[PDB]
Amino acid sequence: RVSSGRDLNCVPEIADTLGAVAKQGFDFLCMPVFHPRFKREFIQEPAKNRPGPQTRSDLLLSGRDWNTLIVGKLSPWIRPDSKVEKIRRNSEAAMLQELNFGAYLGLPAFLLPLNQEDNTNLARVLTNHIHTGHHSSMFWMRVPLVAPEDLRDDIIENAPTTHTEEYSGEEKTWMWWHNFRTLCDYSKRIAVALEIGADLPSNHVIDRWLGEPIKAAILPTSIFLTNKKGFPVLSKMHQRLIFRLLKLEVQFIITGTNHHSEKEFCSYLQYLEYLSQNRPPPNAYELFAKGYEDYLQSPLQPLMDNLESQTYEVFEKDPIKYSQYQQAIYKCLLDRVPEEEKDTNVQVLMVLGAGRGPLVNASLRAAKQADRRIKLYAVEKNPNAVVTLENWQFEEWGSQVTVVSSDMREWVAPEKADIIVSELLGSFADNELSPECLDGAQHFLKDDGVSIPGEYTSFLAPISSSKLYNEVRACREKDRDPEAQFEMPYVVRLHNFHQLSAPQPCFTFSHPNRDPMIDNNRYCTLEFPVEVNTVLHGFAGYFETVLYQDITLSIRPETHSPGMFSWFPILFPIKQPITVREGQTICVRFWRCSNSKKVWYEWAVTAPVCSAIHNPTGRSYTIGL
Amino acid sequence: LPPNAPACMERQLEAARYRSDGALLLGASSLSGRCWAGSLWLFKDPCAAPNEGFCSAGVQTEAGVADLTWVGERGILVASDSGAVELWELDENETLIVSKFCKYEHDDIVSTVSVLSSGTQAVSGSKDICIKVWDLAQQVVLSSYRAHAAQVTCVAASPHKDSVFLSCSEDNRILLWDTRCPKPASQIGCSAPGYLPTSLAWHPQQSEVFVFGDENGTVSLVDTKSTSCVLSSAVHSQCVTGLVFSPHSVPFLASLSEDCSLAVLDSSLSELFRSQAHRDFVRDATWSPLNHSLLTTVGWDHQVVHHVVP
Ligand SMILES: CSC[C@H]1O[C@@H](n2cnc3c(N)ncnc32)[C@H](O)[C@@H]1O
Question: Less crowded by CB within 10 Å, the N or C end of chain B?
């Protein structure tokens, strides 16, 4: 199903008009709150004293209908940024008036136009309306993909259309929006209703709108081609956009007179629902992360915190991860136990942070798979989970498994270990402090001992999403730094966003760590070639680990382990968004810092411009030891 | 109430046109209240306007009427909010008005209409930013033009050439058109860019001169040849909505503005007459064919005012 609406600048009888669009199958109506041609005077007599009513009564519809079925429209005559004083003054009062009426009616959204570069006074007037009471009603800015001046036919002799190359010029429509939105201090209520024309721009220009808050897409009747059978259809490339737009889950709005007069306006809408259902279906991942898109969560800390039962439940809900683990251990055993030594030699396998023992069962299956003999210690500091292990051990595992209720850093092991197995990784790999935990337990691994996982590596990529930037901004909480939100990472299924460059590795860690002096503190400098004009809003985090040899796990999209939903990506926000221009390199600096007590990340952008160093001294965010 | 004739007239009188014979054609819309629509009315007695009862003929239109024009003596061409251009043909007894055709070609409100010299062709201007040329005979659009980058305010046909007309838009562009040329439009204007073009009026006799009004109440007299603005006076305290030349040998210019005021001016654009009669927006002005000293105005005050001009 597609949420779809009808835009009209002509409504004679609101009752009949709304009826029609319902029968035609439209979920909502975009229509004028005052007659589009009904200009109003506020300052100069006598026309200021024009007898009312000034527009049609709220009584003509149910409040419910006003709240759900109607999207308001600013009158086209209202031009707040006019060079003529008297027009700006009347346009100011008219905009307020019309905007206040939408509020009075409880309209769910109100359409405003960005058809020129200077909508400064328009931004200023709306801003006031927004700061006049606190309401949720959305404002859709009608901004065309392609400016109307760059769409005009080359039919003026003396004023010919410029066909010269215009990279930045062909993106002038986004800067219109960017500036308006910026003046209005990135208010959650101001979103984009993107208008599409017959001539699409370059993927380039379409690429500008990736992270932008697009609540609606407006499709004129004009852009629709005619199928053999006279049916409204669309270009393949027009269609690529619609599929793109469907992933962003925008509402669709049909504007203009029905040029396919044979068939009803359900003809146009039929096409969209046709394309909607004809989209390729959602993979497990797409299905798994169905509610979680651009939904910010704090990263888990299973060291300083004791995880809840249902937390482990969803850890365990990913079979691919444990199949990978079984395989790594399967392979490792065969590499350490020759078939001559199978029955004479039994390996000492220690699961460190066993939770409810999914890695214990994997270790067991791996041994029955490798027909080799294994001894198991399940070491777990969470005593709530230690309960689950002991019930498993008693009822099932038997004396083959020795449950150890201890921190791996403290535990004095009876005997040293052939292999150590661990799940101590987060969306940025080292963020749960696997390095420190495994470094502490390292001493009770044999000199020839193996660590599964052997190695892990964080990756970072710059991103643009004004959506998520504002989500972080809104995470401000009383009785803390007002900007603490910006100085902390968030695990999130990034969705409405743009990767500005290729992921590069950040921090790498190897277990065991042979270094004479072991330091898990890291300073990394990274340089991101950017080939588009954009605005940096933060850095997306991913990781890869090597369980054993070729067996690996990745949330890095390029190498992403397929069907594995065990980790969403991490996000490092920045306080102030940074404009980046095509060709420019983004230089970021990441530090992993440590106490006796705590570990944290500090980050800075040095190019194209310097940022503040974020999370200095872990003031805003730290990870417990 | 003639047969089909509505009982009451919409308050907002947008168009006032005098036939050759001296009849009065009125177009009115409903810009407020439950019903947003428009009607067409004929007053064979001009002085009985706007009384719906004492009207020759009357009809109701699906939607509002943004602009209107006479076609010969029996046809009315209608610019609708529907984005449709409609032709309404008069009764033989001229007692009723019937829709010859209603075509939804414009994607937004149809803001302006003019009739070409032939009367077999017409030009439409819309907030869709498009200008279309029509065959009134074939009831189809010959050519559609997307010259402008803003909604088209006014379109006005050359008096004596079927291929030439003016167009003005909020893109600060006045376009001279010749369908004959492969690039039919030519951007024409005063020395410096200025306030948006609002109103266009060709000279009766001097086919190479016209006047445009701006949203700053300044009327400017333009000669195509010289491509430079000959004369400009600030007639109105508001936007200049309409400009209408007298039937006189040396014509007079009627100036209507949102200042709710009318001015009448000589050749040199100097101001002979001014009328504060209207208490709302002055929408149209027609000179009586019968008495050339009589000029009739309509307002959104539903006032039909007959002026005697010195
Ligand atoms: C299964 S997710 C990781 C598991 O490791 C456990 N864990 C984390 N750090 C340590 C540690 N230092 N010693 C023992 N168990 C740990 C956590 O309680 C969690 O159940």
Answer: C
